[PDB]
């Protein structure tokens, strides 16, 4: 990721389709589900803000 329209693809890049599916899944379930998604990065700033 790092953005949803980055290389002019129009949201059809695979790197962006994976991020879209991850966002849909994260919004799928409720806070009260004892399912916490821990995410890691060695470079915070590049990291996308839509997460």
């Amino acid at each position: 990721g790092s953005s949803r329209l980055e290389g002019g693809s129009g949201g059809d890049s695979e790197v962006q389709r994976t991020m879209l599916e991850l966002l849909n899944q994260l919004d799928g379930f409720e806070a009260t589900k004892n399912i916490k998604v821990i995410m890691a990065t060695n470079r915070i700033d590049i990291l996308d803000s839509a997460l």
């Binding site: 953005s3 949803r4 329209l5 980055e6 290389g7 002019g8 129009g10 949201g11 059809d12 879209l20």
Partner: protein, 393 residues
């Protein structure tokens, strides 16, 4: 279903009634005659076996090609998958309303004559920009604006609800509304609300998301954004943080700023240019507006411009009770004591205060939030002000 237009005054009238009664009465005669025929003969067998003749003409191994140019005369140039280019004849059963260049056409195997078309994906960009219902809340969660919300409702919602008002007098709605004001004051929220409340396809974009790292991609993005908005009936576009893209347009600049200016020209043309914009509205936001380009926010492009002041004394009480709404609070919460101070608090600041107080209440295990916690949180949030005190005053 492809019915006639009354084209009487179009406003409640006696002529609209008689042209309307007439179509109804003809539909009634047609329905009666049809029902009579159906009872007299099903015709199910006759209507069937036409499917059989068609399927006979279209052989089993139908081939998915890609139409590339219709000669306007029941002929076509259809490209097979490999890349070859054939010049075939369009038959009589293909719904020609569905034939445009680039459509996945269904050709015959031995003769490649066009015999059908297929649907395509709906997500060139539709999914990525449309916001659906706002998870935050409806118009209930917004208070203190009253006048501003009324303006937006009249600008974007009222022309959809009851067109008769505008239509009666011959005036078209305003074109676009630009929301401007100090940061944290309710622009994006009000746009979200008028989105989740209306009945069109609302699309959202960030200005920094139009700054592209290949040449001629920003203009393509804006052109598409305004291209899939007429494909979708009434539509709204909200380009937030436009300041990052529309700036004063100083000429003494070098680098990628030229591309910024070129995308700005593309937008400036889309909003009001040579062609008719169809049925779409444009909302915009900018924390800093003194720096926009005169041609972007000029009258025919953006008619309505809305200022957004901070909460003064009482909207603060409203917002506070809005965000403290869902939390168990101790019975010593001197909310006014937190509001009375003329600290120039902003709406986002109020949300920050609520969240920080709730979080420290969680930290201390305490089942309830106390006034002392809220005041401590207020001090902590305001701690993010800084600047040079005597300087400037």
């Amino acid at each position: 279903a492809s019915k006639l237009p009354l084209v009487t005054p179009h406003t409640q009238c006696r002529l609209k009634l008689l042209k309307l009664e007439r179509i109804k009465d003809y539909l009634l005669m047609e329905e009666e005659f049809i029902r009579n025929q159906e009872q007299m003969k099903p015709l199910e067998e006759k209507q069937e076996e036409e499917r059989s003749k068609v399927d006979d003409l279209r052989g089993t191994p139908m081939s998915v090609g890609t139409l590339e140019e219709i000669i306007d005369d029941n002929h076509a140039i259809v490209s097979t998958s490999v890349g070859s280019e054939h010049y075939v004849s369009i038959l009589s059963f293909v719904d020609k309303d569905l034939l445009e260049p680039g459509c996945s056409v269904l050709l015959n195997h031995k003769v490649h004559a066009v015999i059908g078309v297929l649907m395509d994906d709906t997500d060139p960009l539709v999914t990525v920009m449309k916001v659906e219902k706002a998870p935050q809340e409806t118009y209930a969660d917004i208070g203190g604006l009253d006048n501003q919300i009324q303006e937006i409702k009249e600008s974007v919602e009222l022309p959809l609800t009851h067109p008769e008002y505008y239509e009666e007098m011959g005036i078209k709605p305003p074109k676009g509304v630009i929301l401007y004001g100090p940061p944290g004051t309710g622009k994006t929220l009000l746009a979200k609300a008028v989105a989740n409340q209306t009945s069109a396809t609302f699309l959202r974009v960030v200005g920094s998301e139009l700054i592209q790292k290949y040449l001629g991609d920003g203009p393509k993005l804006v052109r598409e954004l305004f291209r899939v908005a007429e494909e979708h009936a009434p539509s709204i576009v909200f380009i937030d943080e436009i300041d990052a893209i529309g700036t004063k347009r100083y000429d003494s600049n070098s680098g990628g700023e030229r591309e910024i200016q070129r995308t700005m020209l593309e937008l400036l043309n889309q909003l009001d240019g040579f062609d008719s914009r169809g049925d779409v509205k444009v909302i915009m936001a900018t924390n800093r507006i003194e720096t926009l380009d005169p041609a972007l926010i000029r009258p025919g492009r953006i008619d309505r411009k809305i200022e957004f002041p901070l909460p003064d004394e009482k909207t603060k009480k409203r917002i506070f009770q809005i965000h403290t709404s869902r939390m168990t609070l101790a019975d010593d919460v001197t909310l006014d004591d937190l509001i009375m101070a003329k600290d120039d608090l902003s709406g986002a600041d109020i949300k920050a205060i609520c969240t920080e107080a709730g979080l420290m209440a969680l930290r201390e295990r305490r089942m309830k939030v106390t006034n002392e916690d809220f005041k401590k949180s207020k001090e902590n949030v305001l701690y993010k002000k800084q600047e040079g005190t005597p300087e400037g005053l």
